[PDB]
């Protein structure tokens, strides 16, 4: 009928020391994606992003090994932060000083939480200009702020052949586009 | 407000490269090359420092205070953008 | 207008409290007879006020004779209709046994009144109490928030949540049935009912490792608990107490069934109807003394005097919390300021007015009622916000 | 063209999504007639349009008297078949029953001209049923390439595909059986076949990939009654010798039990058992977590079909494909108001705000020739055959 | 007489140490020689190259170590990119971020796949320029662009009598024949 989560649970925390998160997956599971409301995602690989439900707050880790303990398939991860709800909307914390528990069940991230954590204030959005896409997943739009960007000192490096005066028109272009009163030399 | 471009970071002042609170680093393939980005900061910051040298042509990394947390980006292309490349030597050589 | 110690502080830090103690190893909510007025409840001063203005004439003969209701009180309306019954059956019980047959006559008539009276302010529905699937409909939005809201913020190897009332009234477990939860009570069976007080340490788990259960606790009896010509207690349906005493108690002008009923607290002198009360006070007792308890209470007048002494006795703990709700605090405390205010009143400022910061207690008005502590409780973030399941029921059943 | 969730989609994305959903625990496959018209079959409204015109006489009978069917359904081509074959089972039972020779005589010419009908439109080869190598021709060469597909595409240690049907026909076994791969219908034994519903829990092993399931819901042209209480099944040889050959070329409508296609006879105590069994199966098969399944050819004339399907969306982890030619045809009778109940279910199920419904368009982009193209091959599949020259040089120096 | 992988396996995954890859072989000696339909090959010494099969795609990687653990035994490697076909054959891309699942098998690769990992993009073939063998097996033809080899300088480096009189001579005359007006100093 109604289950507690909209989200399928993939493994169950089974021990931990504090720094690090271990968890086995069900028996079920051998072909690396894992199926949502939204689409398929994955969740094996090393360098991706995964959580785990605890009371009202959602903690977010990121995947580093995949060793072998039908066998039992390990999972180690470190916390990053968490995302919490204040009135409306979503807000994501940059702290990591809380674990979860035993027995925790293990969900991958859709990518409508994954555009809360690459995102912005709203009132910032109207005067921001897009600069691309994120490399996993090709579906995220990234955004910056010109307030912030041009206040301190901008460095930009890169090697002989890999797009910096790319990077550099695009950028010095689309303020002149946006705000016609400004000085650039 | 300044912006530095450069290919050759280790050719600058400690100073002058620390006074950025941003930095958009591209490909870079070379030990001497690699420690002044880690010595403009303080620990805390090491896992995004290992992807740098197997990046493609069009990416980028990208962290500092306009990110809440560290984004590898995928650039767009501008259109018009600059010059395409200078001479060329065959068809020069081959126009008869 | 939220109280701690006798300072003041804004909405901001009593959000943030309110969200740090939702996260604590044991929670309680209790309830009073005020949280039931959302759906066509009344409160015991409406009752009394009924009862005065319906039947006159025996208002008169219980006071010159008897002399156990006073003057003063009928008029401030402050009188306890739960402690009147008690009285009258014992004055019934001491006349019959004596065997005076004129001094019957008067005893078995007030009564009939009283239960007459009582029972249609708890119906909750009127004439439509008898009917089927009573849950869907828009008056009990708030109850289903709350339970959902109590379940699903639990971590795995914590308690499930309980929950104490009051009211003798039919109105969560409406509520609960339609969230499809089960609910322990202590009864078991179908066909005969019975009271196990064994039977509140059992759970649910999963033969191939769902966990929805929360239990539930009343101090007042309920409508639908009986006892047969027998020895033991017996629980019915809605559809069957209508079919057997509920409609005669409510059309038929001469009908007094006796000591069948349980509610509310009538016959505690008899030893088979006070060992449902006296479990629920021991859990009562045994819950609020665990080392990390974090309590709510809303919709509690306190008018009684054990309940208050064991809420009391229990803050002498390092590691209690409270939050009480009472909408009357500045109306009270100008009473109290002149001479002091009725007996709720200064029990309430005597305890506010502690210097502790585990004690707190919330004003303003209006802004204390039911329906604004319901949202005040946090939310889950995977909780889902969206019309899926209600929109796939009904193209089913568009197939034909 | 392509809707997922009310937006639309391009051919790259499509084919992404299908690539994923391929690797999935979970597959299955839901064939429908149309899958059969590429051979030699026929659809269901062909067959009422040659029935129409081959036997006119009997047409006035089923309407004016017995009033099984009606007019405007007819005259729209919008009439079933299984349910009129029951229907006038059921009658001639009881008209068997209760000692009415008058009408009795009725019912046989009735149900011999249209089992005559459906077999003559079963066949895939005409008089070719009965002899050897039917898998070699060139017909059959997209149903091996469906095989290969979804065989090649599971990591070791996985499950194996799962194959439902809605036909009684035998171009699945006929190309099955020449890559030398075995299909699991339930049966065992050669002489005496005998239906037991635990073979599909079995599985093959080395002892010092090979196999599938196939489920079919309507039947075969080599199940039949015997006069013991247990289904037999024979080959396709045996059939044409016993009982298949006489309902085309003569005039002989006896055996009113021995007969076991399509969706009829649901009265007896014995045929009901193994529609029971599949239907099971299909139904608690699709129940599973982290499931995928696609349908092609089928069109959503069956209710029951409609209803488990629409169900079983309720679990988060559900996915499916449809892919259904005639759409836009749809849109336009029922905005404007028409349409038979299938559309209205198409339509209704469209708009729906999920990100687990895709349904493919078109006029011949939605074919079945068109499916296989969007399943992957494997980069180490292999495929220059070659082997084929050194049969033939080994055949050719005897 | 069906055979869905007419290459034969050596391996299986076991562990993913972050960037690492770790290898258990088979029993028998068939780990350390491989014979398909083209030829003989193996896999006996650090520095060799060996394939994941991972569906779409051929995760290609070097190794480096090898021992004992008959006893098992087990292989280490890193990796460079992946092959994967575009429309009737395959291309090579050197980009680094993708790792086969556990499980998967390892096969040796044939001369039909080292080809395509040493070749031009398709098109450069009017100003191809050739050099040399490989020196590892002898098999694949290296060559050169002329729009993108003597487009800026170049440095041709080593010690005395080792031969670099000899490349000089061979790039200069075999540039001077392809185009007959050229200029060299
Ligand atoms: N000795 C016993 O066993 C015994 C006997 C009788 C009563 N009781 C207990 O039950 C009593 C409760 O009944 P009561 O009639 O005294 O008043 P109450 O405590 O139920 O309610 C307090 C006040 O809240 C107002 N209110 C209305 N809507 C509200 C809302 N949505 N949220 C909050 N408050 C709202 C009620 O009108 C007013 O009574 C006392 O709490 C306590 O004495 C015990
Ligand atoms: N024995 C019975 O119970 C009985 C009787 C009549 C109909 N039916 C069936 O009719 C409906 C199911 O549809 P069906 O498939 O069984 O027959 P059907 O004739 O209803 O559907 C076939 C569909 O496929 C389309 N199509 C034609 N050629 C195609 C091709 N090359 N590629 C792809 N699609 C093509 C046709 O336009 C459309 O008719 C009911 O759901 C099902 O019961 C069953
Ligand atoms: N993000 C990008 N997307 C597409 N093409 C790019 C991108 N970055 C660089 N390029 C291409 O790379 C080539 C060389 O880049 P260029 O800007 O000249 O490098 P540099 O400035 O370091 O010399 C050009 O064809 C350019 O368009
Ligand atoms: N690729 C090669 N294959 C075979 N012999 C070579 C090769 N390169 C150089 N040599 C040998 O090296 C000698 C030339 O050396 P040279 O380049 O003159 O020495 P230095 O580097 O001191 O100028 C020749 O005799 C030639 O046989
Ligand atoms: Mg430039
Ligand atoms: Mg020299």
Redesign the interface.
């Known amino acids: 009928l109604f289950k507690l989560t909209e989200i399928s649970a993939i493994g169950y925390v089974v021990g931990l020391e504090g720094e690090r998160i271990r968890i086995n997956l069900h028996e079920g599971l051998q072909g690396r994606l894992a199926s949502h409301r939204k689409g398929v995602s994955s969740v094996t690989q090393p360098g991706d992003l995964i959580g785990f439900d605890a009371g009202n707050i959602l903690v977010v880790a990121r995947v580093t090994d995949m060793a072998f303990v039908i066998p039992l398939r390990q999972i180690i991860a470190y916390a990053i932060g968490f995302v919490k709800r204040e009135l409306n909307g979503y807000v994501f914390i940059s702290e990591d000083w809380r674990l979860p528990a035993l027995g925790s069940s293990a969900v991958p991230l859709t990518s409508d939480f994954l555009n809360i954590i690459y995102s912005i204030d709203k009132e910032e959005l109207p005067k921001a200009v897009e600069l691309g896409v994120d490399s996993r997943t090709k579906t995220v739009k990234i955004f910056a702020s010109v307030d912030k960007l041009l206040s301190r000192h901008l460095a930009v490096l890169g090697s002989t052949g890999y797009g910096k005066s790319n990077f550099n028109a695009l950028l010095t272009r689309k303020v002149s586009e946006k705000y016609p009163n400004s000085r650039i030399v | 407000s300044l912006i530095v471009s450069t290919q050759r970071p280790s050719e600058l002042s400690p100073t002058v490269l620390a006074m950025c609170s941003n930095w958009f680093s591209l490909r870079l393939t070379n030990e001497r090359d690699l420690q002044a980005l880690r010595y403009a900061m303080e620990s805390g910051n090491e896992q995004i420092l290992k992807q740098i040298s197997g990046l493609p042509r069009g990416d980028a990394v990208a962290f500092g205070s306009a990110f809440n947390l560290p984004v590898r980006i995928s650039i767009n292309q501008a259109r018009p953008g600059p010059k395409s490349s200078d001479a060329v030597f065959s068809e020069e050589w081959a126009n008869c | 207008s939220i109280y701690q110690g006798g300072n003041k502080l804004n909405e901001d830090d009593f959000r943030s409290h309110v969200?740090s103690l939702?996260?604590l190893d044991n929670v309680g909510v209790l309830l009073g007879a005020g949280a039931s007025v959302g759906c066509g409840g009344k409160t015991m001063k409406d009752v009394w006020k009924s009862f005065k203005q319906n039947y006159p004439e025996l208002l008169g003969a219980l006071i010159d004779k008897y002399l156990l209701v006073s003057q003063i009180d009928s008029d401030n309306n402050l009188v306890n209709v739960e402690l009147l019954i008690d009285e009258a059956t014992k004055f019934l019980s001491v006349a019959k046994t004596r065997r005076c047959e004129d001094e019957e006559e008067e005893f078995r008539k007030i009564l009939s009144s009283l239960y007459k009276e009582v029972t249609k302010a708890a119906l909750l529905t009127g004439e439509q109490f008898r009917e089927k699937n009573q849950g869907k409909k828009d008056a009990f939005k708030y109850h289903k928030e709350l339970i959902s809201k109590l379940i699903?913020?639990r971590?795995?190897?914590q308690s499930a949540p309980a929950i104490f009332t009051t009211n003798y009234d039919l109105a969560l477990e409406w509520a609960a049935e339609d969230?499809?939860i089960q609910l322990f009570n202590g009864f078991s069976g179908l066909h005969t009912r019975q009271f196990y007080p064994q039977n509140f340490d059992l759970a649910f788990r999963n033969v191939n490792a769902?966990h929805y259960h929360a239990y539930l606790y009343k101090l007042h009896g309920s409508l639908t608990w009986y006892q047969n010509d027998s020895l033991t207690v017996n629980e019915v349906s809605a559809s069957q107490a209508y079919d057997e005493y509920i409609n005669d108690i409510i059309n038929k002008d001469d009908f007094y069934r006796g000591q069948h009923l349980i509610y509310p607290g009538a016959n505690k002198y008899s030893h088979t109807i006070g060992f449902v009360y006296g479990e629920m006070f021991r859990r009562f007792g045994e819950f609020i003394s665990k080392p990390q308890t974090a309590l709510f209470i809303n919709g509690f007048g306190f008018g009684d005097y054990h309940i208050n002494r064991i809420i009391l006795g229990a803050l002498l703990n390092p590691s209690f919390h409270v939050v009480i709700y009472y909408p009357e605090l500045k109306e009270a405390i100008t009473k109290v300021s002149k001479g002091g205010g009725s007996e709720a009143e200064k029990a309430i400022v005597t305890l506010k007015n502690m210097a502790f910061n585990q004690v707190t207690v919330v004003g303003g008005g209006s802004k204390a009622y039911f329906n604004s502590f319901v949202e005040h409780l946090?939310?889950?973030?995977?909780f889902?916000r969206d019309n899926?399941?209600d929109?796939?029921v009904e193209?089913?059943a568009?197939?034909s």
């Open positions: 969200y939702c996260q699903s913020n971590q795995p190897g969230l499809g769902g946090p939310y889950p973030v995977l889902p899926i399941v929109e796939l193209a089913i568009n197939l």
